[PDB]
């Protein structure tokens, strides 16, 4: 199961944040800043892999916006970048040329796509357009 | 900007 | 781009050849590598137009190091440009040959800077003066064989007070890096020269003036007392960094005035209102402003001892000065204002900077122990401050009462009902361990000392080392004050530390004790529950000889850091 | 009721720190104007801001109880952004879920399949050690049903579950038994987790 | 008129002091 | 002794950058960025940072920190006084100091980073005289710079003769929580903004305590003027002989002089204000503005600040005189006040909610200060007795003083 | 300034008003309001949280707020005291173990200064079994009469027949309410 999911641009600023796990907003924040710093300090030939406080913290971003995950030391690492993948798409599908702009603005189709795809960390659904089909279906009951 | 670029570009 | 601004400079034309010499300067400050393009800037050089010529002297000096081949091809051209009739033009010309870090360039560039040192223009004279220093630090060889020691120490005998002022200036730093072989010092008649110029001199020259005098040492009390008397004057100027060489100077000249005459403390009269004043300029320079005054506070605490009100920190006041604050309130606290002092911590008690919070602690706690007279008020507000229920501030209160314990614990026993039960569940290692040894140490006001020393041996194991033997120490000097009541609790601990303890340091000492307890209890009471001698205090003062060089040293990056400055530079 | 889009062009329009600061804290301010009035109108957009600033690091305490009461409320649009702030700013640790418990026990009986659904996937994400005691009866209702769109909710909830409460796990055995037949690639996937778990 | 005080004419010394 | 110096941004690029030795390299720009970050993030961010063998010395500016990298034990202070006067130098110039003009007036900006300092010496600071030999819109330099009056230029011709003084007060009270005032200070200002024709030695004659003292009429309303800091132009050994303020007034507005001695007298705005914050219900605001000031003089635009609380919601406010607003920028209440009679009494009822949450963490209680500004009101006294102006030509000038009393550091601890 | 709007809205009924519905759990708070709202005796499952409805008589919204008795949701009254205009206690007469409990939890829900104008609006719930008291054997024992610059009213109102809703409505809109 993922523990967190934290949507972070290349300047730092976060644009999408989903912690499975309960933990202190102050611990939380903190927590969200080392992995930036992580990231942000890391090169593009580091496997998109950082074993930060002994979690599978994989990086994978394919624009100016990276991401990160938090995956506990029990699955493969390339499920992980496999589901990053697979919402990126979804996200991608759902809304139209997804880029940057519309991370921010539409945040909340965002998080409510994150919610109707993973649910606790775990998948909820392993096709692509099932979950499209249901996000448009509860937009659509206003 | 950087940011109006698609994410994967499909 | 690179083709077409290359075309542009090398035409005929004035109105592209400014362009191309405008787009190549925004270029290397927009952090473009515009080095490549040096040689084709070389060709449109000597142009009429004072406004290319600068650009062009500025690319040359910032393309000076990384192309040094280059720059053979233009040689000729500051020679020319050294000997226009324009001053303007002379001085810069001299400015960019002293700039240019060239080894094969600075050798023919002797000869220019010898013609400018005599020149008549005060400004050409002041870009000579620069210019031989800058020679003299990429070569001094050169400018020794140049013989430019000589033209430099005339400089000051001269007219023009601001060449004056640059040309002590640069043979200031000549001799900063020179090994102290053939040092510039002057007779009283130079020092009476470069006074009578101080006055005429600018803002950025006084300093240069005051800060001659600070490697001079006066050998007569007349001669101190003129000093004093001339320097006295530069107490009243608007330059933060003017009043600071002033105070500098006054302190290393009083090292050989006479507190018995009346000289002494007419100074020492003097400089209190400067240090006031100068306490209240910018924030930047209120760092700097406390490093000068606690560096001068510990050799002349007479002066600012009344200033008390002016060192209260204020609400806007930065983290940098909020800091210095305390530690110069701690420094000139004293019985007379323990009270203002007591009030002021109690105030920044009630912040929520942690770091703010614990510094005021230690300050309340330094001047609790320095002050034997407010021992009480201090006790009360760290009672008070426990009691306020706050994290930091509670640890920060058992620290200052573990502290005041050990160095006033004749009248101690007053507090240590009310820290019998206050909030021990506190996880800070600085604090258990205080409250620890306190409740060993002071096991003799509290009749539950073995029920509250059970709560802190659950986990003795793996709570830490320092904390293990504070607790080993607390059990047993309660077995040998109060054997009855903890006589299986010194058997637990012994067993504990000297069976699963693995510590080298604690294992010893558990079994040093268990070897006393089986050897003869009675001499444990008089070996181990013993009368400690009178606990030294560590003097915050720094040691003469540091306090002597730091001295001289006022306003640098030594006086700062507290620093020696060869301990700092590299 | 100032729009999302807007706070979020007015935010990006700030550049000095202490600038942003002060234009999180107007907003801030309105939003609690709003807030104390009762205004149910409106909530959406001052629920969606208040995420929003604590999103960008602001503290969004005082918007606690908005979103209890935007739970329990009948629109669609104020339940999702009702879910959405007891999902973000709403933990464990917070101490203001407890009353979340009798929103969730109306809301899982909902005959809408999003609202039921939304509500079991806040339950899944903000699990408490009290909550699931209180919702395992529940959740184990909707486990034996045959919705494939909620089949999936329903294991990821009793997963949630049975890792916050490992005693909880024994009520999860007959309700899993003969559910690896199911054709849904979502349904399958689910079930192979909660075996997994157990 | 200007905000913060009319402004006065000042003297050429003390007059009073020789 | 600075190395490199050099004008930074908000985002850590440097927008202009002038070595001076060459003895720092040019990339150690790049670390102080992240050291910057590190000292803030941990509570020991100072001025002067340090990148190994490098120090980073630089002042905080409006949108870039002026940082200026040094290597040897070069004078902090200093560095400190060649930003403060390049700042002041940027003001001259420009009107604005941000990246606007950076970038925009590079060709000018280069010219007097040169000029200004060589080596790591400053020698011309006067903006004024700077401005005769740097312009963005080039001649011989002046012989002003040369010459030892650095700070008038000669040759100024103007049709009147006219000098505008500006005794401009600053009220600073320290009162703490207990009712009591600890810091009260008052630091005059006499800013003048001298147009004459020539280069007159203005002769400042004001009723000094000293000066009464010495003259034998130490028995009148003498001001008591612990420090004096005299401008450059102002002669520090006239001051010091006989008292006798003796200085070429320069070509525009300058401080002359800035007088700062201590307040022994009752503040001229005295606040009484009372906190009945209920326990997360809501929250009372009994505070009562006590004007000590003479009946004559009136405290115009008086903005007593008081702190609301900072989630505070939803707030009333029940005065008798001033408008009252809250800003949720500054989290505070500003009891703003357009005309204060003296002696006049202001009560205000603040009445604010409060969330039923209680907050995460504390967030402090910030002292309360007044904006009091009393025009034609000098607290210290002190009156101008004479300025004796001597021009070689001989004309007759027409002196002007104006005296301006404000508040400066008045603040109210709360309880 | 123009109040035609408000003078023309308060023509036909204008003010709406507010209620809560605090007590001790299974006093049939939860019973009163679906009375109030439906009319019918509908078994609902412990109050973990809160149950929020509203309720329209005499042109006047009365919005019900259900809080539940439990040990968890005693202290979390204080959540609707904020922007709350009135309040109703419901008494468990069928409880004398649990008298001495409702009793102090709102001598503590009475004793706080945010919670001034919110008049007393005693229910005397589970009217129906012969152990249950008087209208004022109860108030005599809470104490009402106590209850300094509060406007407390007992009305005994029965879950399974309904009897004395509309007494109870009536008061707290005449409480409400000061016009014609
Ligand atoms: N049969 C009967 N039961 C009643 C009557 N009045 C109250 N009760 C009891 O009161 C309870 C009412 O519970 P609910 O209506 O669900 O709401 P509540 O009063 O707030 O109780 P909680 O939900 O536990 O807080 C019922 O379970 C009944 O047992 C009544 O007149 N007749
Ligand atoms: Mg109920």
């Known amino acids: 199961m993922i523990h967190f999911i934290l949507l972070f641009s290349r300047q730092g600023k976060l644009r999408l944040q989903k912690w499975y796990i309960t933990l202190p907003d102050k611990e939380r924040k903190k927590i969200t800043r080392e992995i930036v710093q992580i990231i942000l300090s890391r090169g593009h030939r580091t496997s998109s892999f950082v074993d930060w406080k002994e979690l599978k913290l994989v990086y994978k971003r394919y624009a100016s916006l990276y991401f990160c995950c938090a995956i506990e030391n029990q699955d493969n690492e390339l499920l992980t970048l496999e589901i990053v993948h697979r919402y990126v798409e979804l996200l991608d599908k759902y809304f139209g040329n997804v880029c940057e702009l519309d991370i921010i603005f539409n945040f909340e189709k965002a998080y409510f796509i994150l919610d109707e795809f993973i649910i606790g960390g775990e998948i909820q659904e392993t096709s692509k357009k099932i979950a499209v089909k249901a996000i448009e279906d509860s937009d659509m009951l206003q | 900007k950087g940011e109006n670029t698609s994410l994967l570009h499909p | 781009e690179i083709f077409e601004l290359k075309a542009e400079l090398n035409s005929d034309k004035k109105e592209k050849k400014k362009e191309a010499v405008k787009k190549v300067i925004a270029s290397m400050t927009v952090g473009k590598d515009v080095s490549a393009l040096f040689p084709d800037v070389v060709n449109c050089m000597q142009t009429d137009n004072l406004e290319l010529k600068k650009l062009v002297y500025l690319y040359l000096m910032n393309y000076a190091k990384s192309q040094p081949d280059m720059a053979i091809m233009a040689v000729n051209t500051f020679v020319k440009d050294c000997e226009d009739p324009n001053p303007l033009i002379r001085a810069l010309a001299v400015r960019t040959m002293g700039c240019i870090r060239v080894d094969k360039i600075t050798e023919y560039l002797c000869e220019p800077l010898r013609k400018c040192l005599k020149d008549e223009d005060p400004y050409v004279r002041k870009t000579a003066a620069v210019c031989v220093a800058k020679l003299h630090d990429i070569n001094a060889q050169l400018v020794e064989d140049q013989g430019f020691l000589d033209t430099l120490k005339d400089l000051i005998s001269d007219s023009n007070p601001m060449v004056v002022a640059n040309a002590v200036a640069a043979l200031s730093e000549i001799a900063e890096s020179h090994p102290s072989s053939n040092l510039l010092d002057l007779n009283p008649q130079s020092i009476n020269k470069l006074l009578t110029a101080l006055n005429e001199c600018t803002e950025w020259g006084q300093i240069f003036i005051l800060d001659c005098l600070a490697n001079y040492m006066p050998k007569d009390d007349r001669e101190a007392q003129s000093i004093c008397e001339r320097v006295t004057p530069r107490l009243s100027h608007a330059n933060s960094a003017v009043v600071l060489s002033a105070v500098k100077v006054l302190m290393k000249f009083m090292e050989m005035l006479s507190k018995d005459l009346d000289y002494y403390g007419t100074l020492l009269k003097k400089l209190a209102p400067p240090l006031v004043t100068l306490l209240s300029a910018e924030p930047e320079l209120q760092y700097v402003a406390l490093r000068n005054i606690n560096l001068i506070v510990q050799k002349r605490p007479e002066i600012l001892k009344h200033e008390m009100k002016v060192f209260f920190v204020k609400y806007n006041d930065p983290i940098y000065v909020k800091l210095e604050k305390l530690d110069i309130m701690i420094r000139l606290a004293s019985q007379a204002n323990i009270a203002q002092v007591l009030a002021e911590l109690r105030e920044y008690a009630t912040e929520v900077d942690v770091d703010f919070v614990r510094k005021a602690v230690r300050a309340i706690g330094r001047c609790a122990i320095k002050v034997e007279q407010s021992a009480e008020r201090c006790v009360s507000t760290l009672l008070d401050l426990i009691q306020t229920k706050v994290n930091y501030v509670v640890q920060e209160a058992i620290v200052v009462i573990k502290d005041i314990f050990r160095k006033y614990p004749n009248k101690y026993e007053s507090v240590i009902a009310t820290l019998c039960e206050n909030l021990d569940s506190l996880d800070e290692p600085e604090a258990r361990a205080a409250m620890i040894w306190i409740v060993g140490e002071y096991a003799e006001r509290i009749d539950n000392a073995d029920e509250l020393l059970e709560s802190f041996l659950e986990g003795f194991h793996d709570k830490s080392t320092q904390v293990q033997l504070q607790l080993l120490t607390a059990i047993v000097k309660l077995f040998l004050k109060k054997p009855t009541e903890t006589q299986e609790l010194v058997q637990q601990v012994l067993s504990l530390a000297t069976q699963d303890s693995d510590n080298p340091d604690l294992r010893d000492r558990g079994y040093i004790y268990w070897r006393l307890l089986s050897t003869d209890p009675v001499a444990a009471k008089e070996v181990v529950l013993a009368e400690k001698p009178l606990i030294s205090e560590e003097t915050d003062l720094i040691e003469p000889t540091l306090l002597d060089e730091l001295i001289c040293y006022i306003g640098t990056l030594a006086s700062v850091y507290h620093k020696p400055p060869s301990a700092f530079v590299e | 009721p100032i729009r999302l889009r807007e706070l979020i062009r007015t935010i990006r329009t700030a550049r000095t720190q202490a600038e942003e600061r002060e234009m999180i804290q107007k907003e801030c301010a309105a939003i609690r104007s709003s807030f104390r009035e009762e205004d149910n109108t409106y909530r959406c957009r001052n629920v969606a801001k208040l995420l929003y600033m604590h999103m960008l690091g602001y503290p969004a305490h005082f918007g606690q109880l908005e979103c209890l009461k935007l739970i329990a409320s009948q629109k669609f649009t104020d339940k999702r952004i009702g879910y959405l702030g007891a999902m973000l700013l709403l933990d464990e640790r917070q101490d203001v879920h407890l009353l979340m418990t009798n929103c969730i026990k109306n809301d899982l009986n909902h005959s809408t399949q999003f609202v039921q659904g939304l509500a079991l996937c806040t339950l899944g994400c903000m699990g408490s050690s009290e909550m699931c005691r209180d919702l395992a009866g529940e959740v184990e209702k909707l486990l034996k049903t045959s919705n494939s769109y909620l089949r999936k909710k329903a294991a990821l909830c009793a997963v949630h579950v049975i890792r916050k409460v490992p005693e909880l796990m024994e009520m999860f055995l007959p309700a899993t038994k003969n559910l690896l037949n199911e054709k849904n690639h979502g349904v399958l996937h689910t079930s192979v987790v909660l075996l997994t778990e157990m | 008129d200007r905000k913060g005080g009319s402004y006065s004419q000042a003297a050429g010394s003390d007059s009073a002091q020789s | ?415 | 300034g123009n109040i035609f709007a408000n003078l023309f809205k308060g023509l036909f009924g204008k003010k709406e008003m507010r209620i809560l519905m605090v007590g001790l759990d299974a006093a049939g708070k939860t019973t009163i309001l679906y009375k109030l709202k439906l009319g019918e005796i509908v078994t609902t499952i412990p109050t973990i949280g809160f149950n929020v409805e509203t309720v329209e008589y005499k042109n006047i919204s009365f919005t019900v707020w259900d809080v539940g008795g439990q040990d968890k949701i005693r202290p979390l009254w204080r959540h609707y005291f904020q922007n709350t205009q009135g309040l109703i206690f419901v008494v468990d007469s069928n409880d004398r173990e649990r008298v001495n409990e409702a009793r102090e939890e709102l001598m503590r829900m009475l004793a706080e200064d945010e919670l001034r104008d919110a008049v007393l609006l005693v229910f005397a719930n589970k009217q129906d079994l012969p152990n249950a008291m008087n209208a004022a054997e109860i108030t005599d024992k809470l104490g009402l009469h106590s209850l300094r610059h509060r406007n407390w009213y007992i009305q005994a109102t029965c879950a399974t027949s309904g009897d004395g809703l509309y007494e109870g409505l009536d008061w707290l809109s005449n409480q409400l309410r000061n016009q014609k």
């Not at chain 6, 990298?69 to 110039?93: D, G, I, P, R, W």
């Not at chain 6, 005032?181 to 200002?189: A, M, Q, T």
């Not at chain 6, 070689?392 to 000038?397: D, E, N, T």
Request: glycine share 6%; hydrophobic share 40%.
């Open chain 6, 1 to 415: 002794s600075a190395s490199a110096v050099y004008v930074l941004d908000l985002k850590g690029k440097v927008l202009i950058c002038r070595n001076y030795r060459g003895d720092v390299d040019m990339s150690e720009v790049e670390h102080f960025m992240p050291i910057l970050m590190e000292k803030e993030e941990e509570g020991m961010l100072s001025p002067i940072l340090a990148h190994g063998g490098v120090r980073f010395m630089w002042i905080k500016h409006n949108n870039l920190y002026l940082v200026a990298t040094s290597k040897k034990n070069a004078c902090v202070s200093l560095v400190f006084s060649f930003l403060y006067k390049v700042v002041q130098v940027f003001s001259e110039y420009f009107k604005e100091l941000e990246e606007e003009s950076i970038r925009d007036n590079f060709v000018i900006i280069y010219e007097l980073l040169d000029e200004l300092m060589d080596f790591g010496y400053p020698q011309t600071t006067d903006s004024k005289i700077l401005q005769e030999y740097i312009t963005q819109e080039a001649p011989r330099p002046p012989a002003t710079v040369t010459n030892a009056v650095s700070w008038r230029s000669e040759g100024i011709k103007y049709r009147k003769n006219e000098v505008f003084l500006d005794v401009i007060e600053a009220v600073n009270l320290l009162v703490s929580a207990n009712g009591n005032v600890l810091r009260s200070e008052i630091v005059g200002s006499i800013k003048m903004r001298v147009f004459l024709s020539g280069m007159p030695e203005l002769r400042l004659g004001l009723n000094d305590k000293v000066l009464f003292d010495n003259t034998g009429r130490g028995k009148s309303k003498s001001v008591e003027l612990e420090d004096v800091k005299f401008h450059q132009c102002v002669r520090l050994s006239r001051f010091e002989n006989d008292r006798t303020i003796s200085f070429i007034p320069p070509d525009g507005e300058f401080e002359l002089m800035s007088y700062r001695l201590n307040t022994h007298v009752k503040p001229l705005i005295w606040i009484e204000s009372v906190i009945e914050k209920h326990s997360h219900s809501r929250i009372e605001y009994m505070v009562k503005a006590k004007s000590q000031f003479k009946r004559r003089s009136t405290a115009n635009n008086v903005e007593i600040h008081i702190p609301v609380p900072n989630d505070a919601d939803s707030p009333k406010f029940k005065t008798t005189v001033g408008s009252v607003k809250w800003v949720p920028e500054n989290s505070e209440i500003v009891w703003s006040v357009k005309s204060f009679p003296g002696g006049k009494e202001y009560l205000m009822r603040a009445h604010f909610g409060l969330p039923s949450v209680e907050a995460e963490d504390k967030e402090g209680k910030p002292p309360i200060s007044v904006k009091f500004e009393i025009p034609y009101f000098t607290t210290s006294g002190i009156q101008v007795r004479y300025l004796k102006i001597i021009e070689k030509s001989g004309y007759q000038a027409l002196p002007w003083v104006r005296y301006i009393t404000q508040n400066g550091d008045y603040q109210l601890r709360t309880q």
